[PDB]
Design an enzyme around this catalytic site. Structure first.
Site, PDB file in Angstrom:
ATOM      1  N   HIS A  65      93.876  75.281  74.425  1.00 29.21           N
ATOM      2  CA  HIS A  65      94.317  76.102  75.573  1.00 29.21           C
ATOM      3  C   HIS A  65      95.738  76.632  75.376  1.00 29.21           C
ATOM      4  CE1 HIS A  65      90.879  74.003  77.680  1.00 29.21           C
ATOM      5  NE2 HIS A  65      90.634  75.277  77.933  1.00 29.21           N
ATOM      6  N   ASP A 217      85.545  83.706  78.560  1.00 33.28           N
ATOM      7  CA  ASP A 217      86.150  82.371  78.400  1.00 33.28           C
ATOM      8  C   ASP A 217      85.466  81.600  77.259  1.00 33.28           C
ATOM      9  OD1 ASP A 217      88.092  80.328  78.974  1.00 33.28           O
ATOM     10  OD2 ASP A 217      87.241  79.856  80.922  1.00 33.28           O
TER      11      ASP A 217
END
Ligand SMILES: COc1cc(C(=O)N2CCC[C@H](c3ccnc4ncnn34)C2)cc(OC)c1OC
Ligand SMILES: [Mg+2]
Ligand SMILES: [Zn+2]
Length: 324
Positions: A65, A217
């Site tokens: 991330h 995503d």
């Protein structure tokens, strides 16, 4: 520079992680130009530049991330605009919010998930736990804090009405990246693949944008095996630090978070089959040109089964059994 960056750039086969980290800010700009958003909404450029860079810096460097994640989610959003029409399904301003959202959606991620924020009683849990989607509300909060930093408000010139609409969209889209959320509205997305999409129904617009935020995503799984395996490594490195910290805290992490129980092949398969493929099945049903993406995730789903046997130790590790 325009999309002079690479011939494959608008292609589903292109890999944005191949792009040097130093060239990613500029690539953001190049995508906003090619979709023609900068002239549409007449974005001030030095303002937009500063925004891009405050976004980039707003990311930390855990294994998965991080900014290159955000870049790569954004890139896929761009690819949807090129390869699917979308304009016949969604208002331009919704597509532009989908892209800005992509950029901003994991801002200041600390490499841990929602329940861990709650478990560890972080400042973020205090703020958001009771409404849910702790990290995603924080992601949205950070975007807002950037927009309200001097010289970074890429919407300061929008009509009151258009500015409001940008905030609602970004909020809802950022929120929809919580996989908990997706899994809750999956049956609603399903109704919109049986009754067909209705260009005039506002909830269909809302639901469609969520499907595509997720699609972006998870867009690492639509690339070739090389990428999928590397990203698997990054993901579990990140998940296993979380497991480790939770044991220290005196809790049992989830199988997928605990490095002594995590069997990566099973976990990847299950993710490919039951989370990720049905997402791109719904994408295909809504868009026939999205079919290759489904086929690309299913290839990768079949290839882990082709390599799982490798996770049973046959012979010696290294040539030593001292590990027992
Ligand atoms: C709700 O069920 C799951 C959630 C997640 C998850 O938290 N994710 C958020 C962090 C990025 C992950 C991801 C992104 C892209 N490719 C990915 N491959 C495996 N995880 N993965 C998904 C992962 C899972 O398996 C690996 C799940 O079931 C098997
Ligand atoms: Mg996220
Ligand atoms: Zn993300």
């Amino acid at each position: 520079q325009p999309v002079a960056i690479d011939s494959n750039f608008a292609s589903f086969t292109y890999t944005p992680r191949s792009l040097p980290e130093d060239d990613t800010s500029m690539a953001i700009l190049s995508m906003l130009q090619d979709m023609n958003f900068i002239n549409n909404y007449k974005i001030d450029c030095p303002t937009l530049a500063r925004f891009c860079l405050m976004v980039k810096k707003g990311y930390r460097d855990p294994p998965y991330h991080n900014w290159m994640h955000a870049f790569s989610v954004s890139h896929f959003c761009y690819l949807l605009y090129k390869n699917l029409e979308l304009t016949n399904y969604l208002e331009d301003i919704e597509i532009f919010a989908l892209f800005i959202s992509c950029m901003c959606h994991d801002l200041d991620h600390r490499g841990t998930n929602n329940s861990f924020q709650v478990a560890s009683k972080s400042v973020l849990a205090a703020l958001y736990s009771s409404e849910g989607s702790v990290m995603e509300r924080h992601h949205f909060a950070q975007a807002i804090a950037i927009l309200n930093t001097h010289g970074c408000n890429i919407f300061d010139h929008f009509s009151r009405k258009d500015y409001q609409r940008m905030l609602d969209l970004m909020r809802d889209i950022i929120l929809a990246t919580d996989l908990a959320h997706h899994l809750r509205i999956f049956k609603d997305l399903q109704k919109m693949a049986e009754v067909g999409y209705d260009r005039n129904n506002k909830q269909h617009h809302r639901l469609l944008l969520c499907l595509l935020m997720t699609s972006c995503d998870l867009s690492d799984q639509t690339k070739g095996w090389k990428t999928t395996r590397k990203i698997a490594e990054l993901i579990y490195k990140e998940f296993f630090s979380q497991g480790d910290l939770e044991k220290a805290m005196g809790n049992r992490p989830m199988e997928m978070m605990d490095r002594e129980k995590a069997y990566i092949p099973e976990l990847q398969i299950s993710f490919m089959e039951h989370i990720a493929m049905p997402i791109y099945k719904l994408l295909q049903d809504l868009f026939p040109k999205a079919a290759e993406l489904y086929e690309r995730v299913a290839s990768n789903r079949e290839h882990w089964t082709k390599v799982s046997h490798k996770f049973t130790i046959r012979g010696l590790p290294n040539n030593s059994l001292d590990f027992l």
